[PDB]
Amino acid sequence: HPAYSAREQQWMADHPVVKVAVLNLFAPFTLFREQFGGISAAVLQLLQLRTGLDFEIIGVDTVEELIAKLRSGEADMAGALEVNSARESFLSFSRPYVRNGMVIVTRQDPDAPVDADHLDGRTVALVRNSAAIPLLQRRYPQAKVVTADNPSEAMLMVANGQADAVVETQISASYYVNRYFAGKLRIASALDLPPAEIALATTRGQTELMSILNKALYSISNDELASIISRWR
């Protein structure tokens, strides 16, 4: 499929190996077993075939570090970030390769109460900087929002009594609940928020590379992505 331009060809001749920064603990998206894994690792492999590019993976714990590596040029692109308007004056995001609704996760009960989403007057954990936060507070004006370092720790606060609920993507909620918290937490309901979008990212000046990545993603079908995403449920 993809039709690269002559400038994009040149860029690939000069950069046969592209450095990709990823978050260390952003499962089921990016993770390290210490082989790189997760949904985004399999996507980047499909993109290797589409582009002919070799990818060198650099893992970091925090998004601030991942962004500092892009700004210094030590990394050429990010393998997975949540698209976030607050980041757009510094970063470009590719077309998303995951778009997924948000849910609320609560402690298990024999009862599945109808008011689990009554966040007004309750304490809700999210990942620090989560794009969901501003929005969440515009809804639920009287929700008390607390932040955590990564999905696992957000989930851990609820399992601990430290929060009433955690807000996360359906994908990430299913993964942590079924694998690290079976019998302790559960997806209580869907939330009305717009879906999280997971994309690649570069700095804003990175013309050729981002155009290459968008054409290469465009040529990945939804069925190919669903085969990968369905294995992390």
Task: Write down all domains in the chain, each with its CATH number in brackets.
Answer: 1-100+196-233 (3.40.190.10), 101-195 (3.40.190.10)
b/e burial code for range 40-61 (CB count within 10 A of at least 16 → b): bbbbbebbeebbebebebbbbe
**Three-state secondary-structure class, residue 229:** helix
CA distance 4 to 216: 9
Burial category of 115 from C-beta neighbours within 10 Å (exposed 0-12, middle 13-18, buried 19 and up): exposed
Q: Which structure tokens are listed for 228? A: 């990968």
- The answer to whether 65 and 23 have CB atoms below 8 angstroms apart is no
CA 178 to chain centre: 18
**Ranges of H-type helices in 54-191:** 63-72, 132-138, 151-160, 170-180
3-state percent helix, strand, coil for the chain, nearest multiple of 5: 35, 30, 35
Half-sphere exposure (CA, 13 Å, Cβ side) for 27?
20
Half-sphere exposure (CA, 13 Å, Cβ side) for 176?
30
Q: Which structure tokens are listed for 167? A: 């807000």
CA distance 105 to 166: 5
Longest dimension (CA), the chain: 62
**Three-state secondary-structure class, residue 174:** helix
* Residues ≥6 apart with Cβ < 8 Å to 190: 101, 102, 103, 170
